[PDB]
Amino acid sequence: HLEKSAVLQEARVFNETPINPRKCAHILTKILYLINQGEHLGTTEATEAFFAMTKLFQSNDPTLRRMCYLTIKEMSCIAEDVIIVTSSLTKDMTGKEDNYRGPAVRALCQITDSTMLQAVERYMKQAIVDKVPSVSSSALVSSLHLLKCSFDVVKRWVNEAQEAASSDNIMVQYHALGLLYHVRKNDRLAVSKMISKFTRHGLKSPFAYCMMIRVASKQLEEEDGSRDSPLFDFIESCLRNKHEMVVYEAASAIVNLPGCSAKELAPAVSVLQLFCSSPKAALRYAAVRTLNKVAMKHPSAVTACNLDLENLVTDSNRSIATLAITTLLKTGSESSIDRLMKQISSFMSEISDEFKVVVVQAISALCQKYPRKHAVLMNFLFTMLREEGGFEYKRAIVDCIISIIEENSESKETGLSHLCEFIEDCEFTVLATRILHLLGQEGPKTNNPSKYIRFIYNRVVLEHEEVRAGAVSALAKFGAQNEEMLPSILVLLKRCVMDDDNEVRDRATFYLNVLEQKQKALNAGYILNGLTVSIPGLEKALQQYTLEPSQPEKVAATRQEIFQEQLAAVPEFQGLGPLFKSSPEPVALTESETEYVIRCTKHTFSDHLVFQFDCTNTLNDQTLENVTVQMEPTEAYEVLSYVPARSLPYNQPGTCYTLVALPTEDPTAVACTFSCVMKFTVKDCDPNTGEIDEEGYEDEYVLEDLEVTVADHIQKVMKVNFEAAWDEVGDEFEKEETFTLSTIKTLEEAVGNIVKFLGMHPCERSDKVPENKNTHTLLLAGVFRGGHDILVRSRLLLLDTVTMQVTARSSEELPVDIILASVG
Amino acid sequence: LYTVKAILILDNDGDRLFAKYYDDTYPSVKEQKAFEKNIFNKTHRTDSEIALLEGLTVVYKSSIDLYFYVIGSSYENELMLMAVLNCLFDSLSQMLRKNVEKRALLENMEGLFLAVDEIVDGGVILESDPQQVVHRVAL
Amino acid sequence: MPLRLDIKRKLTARSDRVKSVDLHPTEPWMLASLYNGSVCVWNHETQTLVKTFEVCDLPVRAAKFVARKNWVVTGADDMQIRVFNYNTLERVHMFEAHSDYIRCIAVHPTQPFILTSSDDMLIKLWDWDKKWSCSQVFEGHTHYVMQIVINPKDNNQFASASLDRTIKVWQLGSSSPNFTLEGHEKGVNCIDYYSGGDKPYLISGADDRLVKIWDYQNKTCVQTLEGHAQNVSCASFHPELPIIITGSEDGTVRIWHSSTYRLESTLNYGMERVWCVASLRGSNNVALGYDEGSIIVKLGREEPAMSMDANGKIIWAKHSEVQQANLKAMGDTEIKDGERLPLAVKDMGSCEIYPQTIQHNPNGRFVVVCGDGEYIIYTAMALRNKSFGSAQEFAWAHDSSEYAIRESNSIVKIFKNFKEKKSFKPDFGAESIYGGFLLGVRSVNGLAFYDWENTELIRRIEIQPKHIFWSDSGELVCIATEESFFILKYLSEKVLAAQETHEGVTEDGIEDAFEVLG
């Protein structure tokens, strides 16, 4: 239509004296036209045009004002000294009428940056509360843009934003709730308060419902303090308003992840909610679906089926038919697959071009995804090969072949062989590469390789370089794997085809010379089956889904080992007792992502305990350095050393340790409590993940106590015969004490309490005791730190409560004393 | 805050009489036109309120020599999108003082540009009331 | 919208229609000018009437103090402003301020001037030092000049309100009003400035039932205030608190929040027809003139809400580098004890409610913001929502992971881990709460202490408290009382036998479980 240069240029007159609202407005229209028609502005002339226009803001005409808003936003980024236009926009923005109000806030806020943010706020507060949708919605979207430049200004507007939220007017609410969710967010909980306020309400605003559904879709039970249900009384889990999109979004989330469970007037576990909307017009597309559903997509699938299946079969309209395939695909599942496959077979008949490729891929893809047997997948993959013969590709040769060598290989090659009979050189580089690669790699004894070779030999002549090169190298590997083959390799390679073309020659000269001339140490080594060049995943199935309706390694296996590894890096802990075990009951001192996350584990050594404290400073305003967790033992333990966490910045874990020595004569338990306080140096930080200030202050954060149990000292085992082990460990360290467990009225619980506490597995599966028997003998075994066995015998008497005489024997005085004390 | 991906009003080839991009995904002419040609090819010569293109529900209508578009998300349905598309058709008609054809749009290029910006704002649906848009805009 | 208020009737006096009410520029006295032909002043702190002056035998509409001269200016229906010494009790000067009675007088302490506004449509200037010569005459107003106020950003500027639907901003230098504002639509009874060094505001009151707020800097009308349900006689701005106090001839005074203009209170008195308002410039006293008398009233918020933990997060609300709505503040500074230490604030995360009281945890793990019958708990230095609860009052106890709340059902409540404790529920009633370990609840002219063990009445102390705070051993308590102070001993063993036995009476207690230490 227009020329960008002439129009950008003539705009410069505004900058001088002429303001002429008609002429300038036209010139502006022309700018909008240059963009719209599709053109790109030249920067010098743009920069000039922008400074000129600001003069035009003096004249207040509604069409000129309008031109001015669109033109400055489009020209804003390809212009300089734009800042002048802010004042003019504020002047316009306060002027009453929707033409100015709404369009200005949007143009102003786009140009506005954090410095300028402050200016627009009075006018913004006035514009947001409006139940006149233009002014309010433009102001609400405007605030969203402004969250970037400066967050804090926008946040103050949360009250005006909320005020708009209370409208049932669709725009004012959609914008209000949507924006609010973004704005007020400083934690989940404050947003959740905003949502609960609207939540109990039966809106007539579908957009608000939708934007909110998304916020809601996850279970929120902290909305406005707390509440006893994930409840959403606005359609998400409810079905207060029917309207097929909202109904679909809501129904797929709620069914197997309740936003609330099913109500008689609002299904929300049952499959129903989608289905009542399901017979419909074009509208049906949302309605008919599924996704998730109780307990599977399949009972759901049956409802809707008439609709999806008739459109999919009948309509050879692309627009309908696509909705019908997506809808079939959605009502699908593992079960559904029988049905889904016949339909997809049928579908290509309506739209057959790419759609053909897709159905032959889909039937294979569905068989791989939803199991109807891996074999059937191969058989479908043959049908794909047959029908298209060329829309298979290179990625198919690699994917078919890799997939095939899971089971199919002998068959696949053979099928491929037959498939190769097709068409000599229009079959493509890829099929020849597949029969060639497979015949090379398997080295057929399932069928005679001679047919395969004869088929491939012809294809090579008239097809691309990459296959002819493929054919020589394959032949060489084929030689190395099977001796028999060598005579065919020679007739093929001497030919002008499989060698002596171009690329084919170079590869061949190498491959040939290595087979012919050389040892074939290399050739032998090279064939490991004669496999592909790469093993990807199973690419086809996802591709197909969209297209149709258009080494974790480990050391440790035990808590002691993983901790032992962590400990081992540090010297002191392995140098001063080596680790018998680490706790089977590690206790987290301070909860996750609050102030600190500290998890401590107590590790036992031959004569020591090391406490590993994994410390996180989740303090947004700080970053920590030289952090240690300090300890006060409540019994006689010596605290030898502290190992610091070098730094703990915001949200970054670090580990600190305290090594203490264990008593080895203590008459009371090694079940003991340590009071923990982390001390550290704080340097100020701007929350990101870390950043330290030039100077800072000392600060401390209090932590929970760490409890060490007898369970940490002992590792559980059972014995085949307790009595022998029990005598064998040391009846010379034997001590006996009688306890009453009055809070345990039966033997079975009693055995469980001694077993858990001590960290001893009761022998011979003695946690199950004959219910309410007068006498019982409980056999305990486990190994104590240092590597010495500890056996405990508890002879239980059951009155109405449990009394036990617990006799313990151990290779030391300490386990005996420790167990006896801890139990009572 | 997002519903509408883009709005296009296209001649009966898919070429840009108009498009205004409420996505940031097409700003350059080459690609804005490619998009336009892409959506017009699927959707056209099968009029319904549904089309699925690019994994997005595309809602469209037609006139004498134009096809009118809203592209939006496919987690929705036609009807939500349709309310935008109905506003788009309607508001342009009342605004221009003549029904949407290539002739009405070209007749008043300014009314068309302004009217569409009121309907969609950066992919959020700013307005959907045809009457409101028309008063809001000044020719 | 919520605001710290507490309306209190500081002093009342009955007299014929008082057109003007004033606070003495620097003294604790309030002067009211009456239609008794007398102006009377009373110091409403000690409740002593300091002096009366008989200006005229016909109504005195205006009176104000020119504190420096130790003189009072009055303008009466003599059409004179007569000046008197308020300690040497005699008439200092007599002069004709206007050709008509003098509705209001404004005093410039920094200049020798009083300008007076009269219903001869003119405001005239008099200079006290010249012996009340006419310094300047202002001609601008074409109607009855109801009120005059001096702008506190330039005392050379004043605005005068006239029933001509404008308030005209004038300068001393210029007889004429140097610009006009059209502040109201049914005549302007009053003009006031919103006081301060950075506040260019006007207010207009009118008999269209409405008070309007204007910004003199921008020249726009910021908002319209509903005022009253009958002609707004006067309207004024409170300085400290965000409110506007208006009066109407319906005998009602209303207080409006100046952030959304939602009704904070409606006050009637049995005095009715409220003609004027004025506010103390040092803030929290407003006085209102009525037909049947005058009242001086005292507004609430006298003290700040804040708490100092051990993390150096000393949190307040409002103030600098903190917003009122959100929550913040830190104080890590230790500079010399002899002066006031800097703000030293560090930023702190989310809030969702207004802070009626806002407090850090005494050892630093929680933050509490309390407000509107609800408490919200935010985490010490991270400020993520920890917890929630109900609280018309919230107090941390000694335990500070057990706290006392008044849930206002007539039982003082304890919440532990911010979850309600129903093992705590007084066999007293309640009227009010004191925190600490033994919760004191005040009811039936008693202070009763309750157990956090079985909520039996341990003891009742017969002098009610201001506070109970309990030591961090919970055997010793410090009682703030009108008595002065008690320290009491809770003997733990004695309490365990007594409480179990429930020998402690429902409303009188057992006088042994607690003992009075000192």
Curated annotation (Swiss-Prot), chain A:
Residues 559-824 are annotated as: Interaction with ZNF289/ARFGAP2. Keywords: Cytoplasm, Cytoplasmic vesicle, ER-Golgi transport, Golgi apparatus, Membrane, Phosphoprotein, Protein transport, Repeat, Transport. HEAT repeats lie at residues 44-81, 263-300, 302-335, 336-372. It is found in: Cytoplasm, Cytosol; Golgi apparatus membrane; Cytoplasmic vesicle, COPI-coated vesicle membrane. The keyword Glycoprotein does not apply. Its main location: cytoplasm. It holds the Pfam family COP-gamma_platf. GO terms for cellular component: COPI vesicle coat; cytosol; Golgi membrane. Belongs to the COPG family. PANTHER family: COATOMER SUBUNIT GAMMA, COATOMER SUBUNIT GAMMA-1. The coatomer is a cytosolic protein complex that binds to dilysine motifs and reversibly associates with Golgi non-clathrin-coated vesicles, which further mediate biosynthetic protein transport from the ER, via the Golgi up to the trans Golgi network. Coatomer complex is required for budding from Golgi membranes, and is essential for the retrograde Golgi-to-ER transport of dilysine-tagged proteins. This is Coatomer subunit gamma-1. It comes from Mus musculus. The gene is Copg1.
From Swiss-Prot, chain B:
It is a peripheral membrane protein. GO terms for biological process: intra-Golgi vesicle-mediated transport; intracellular protein transport; retrograde vesicle-mediated transport, Golgi to endoplasmic reticulum. GO terms for cellular component: COPI vesicle coat; Golgi membrane. Keywords: Acetylation, Cytoplasm, Cytoplasmic vesicle, ER-Golgi transport, Golgi apparatus, Membrane, Protein transport, Transport. It is found in: Cytoplasm; Golgi apparatus membrane; Cytoplasmic vesicle, COPI-coated vesicle membrane. Oligomeric complex that consists of at least the alpha, beta, beta', gamma, delta, epsilon and zeta subunits. Belongs to the adaptor complexes small subunit family. The coatomer is a cytosolic protein complex that binds to dilysine motifs and reversibly associates with Golgi non-clathrin-coated vesicles, which further mediate biosynthetic protein transport from the ER, via the Golgi up to the trans Golgi network. Coatomer complex is required for budding from Golgi membranes, and is essential for the retrograde Golgi-to-ER transport of dilysine-tagged proteins. The zeta subunit may be involved in regulating the coat assembly and, hence, the rate of biosynthetic protein transport due to its association-dissociation properties with the coatomer complex. This is Coatomer subunit zeta-1. The lineage of its organism: Eukaryota, Metazoa, Chordata, Craniata, Vertebrata. The chain holds residues 10 to 148 of 177 of the full protein.
Swiss-Prot record, chain C:
It comes from the Eukaryota. GO terms for biological process: intra-Golgi vesicle-mediated transport; intracellular protein transport; retrograde vesicle-mediated transport, Golgi to endoplasmic reticulum. One of its GO terms (molecular function) is structural molecule activity. Signal peptide: none annotated. Disruption phenotype: The knockout of the gene results in early embryonic lethality with no viable embryos recovered at 12.5 dpc. WD repeats lie at residues 13-52, 55-94, 97-136, 140-180, 183-224, 227-266, 350-388, 390-425. Keywords: Acetylation, Coiled coil, Cytoplasm, Cytoplasmic vesicle, ER-Golgi transport, Golgi apparatus, Membrane, Phosphoprotein, Protein transport, Repeat, Transport, WD repeat. It is found in: Cytoplasm, Cytosol; Golgi apparatus membrane; Cytoplasmic vesicle, COPI-coated vesicle membrane. Belongs to the WD repeat COPB2 family. The coatomer is a cytosolic protein complex that binds to dilysine motifs and reversibly associates with Golgi non-clathrin-coated vesicles, which further mediate biosynthetic protein transport from the ER, via the Golgi up to the trans Golgi network. Coatomer complex is required for budding from Golgi membranes, and is essential for the retrograde Golgi-to-ER transport of dilysine-tagged proteins. Oligomeric complex that consists of at least the alpha, beta, beta', gamma, delta, epsilon and zeta subunits. Probably interacts with PEX11A. Interacts with SCYL1. Interacts with JAGN1. This is Coatomer subunit beta'. The lineage of its organism: Eukaryota, Metazoa, Chordata, Craniata, Vertebrata. The gene is Copb2. The chain holds residues 1 to 518 of 905 of the full protein.
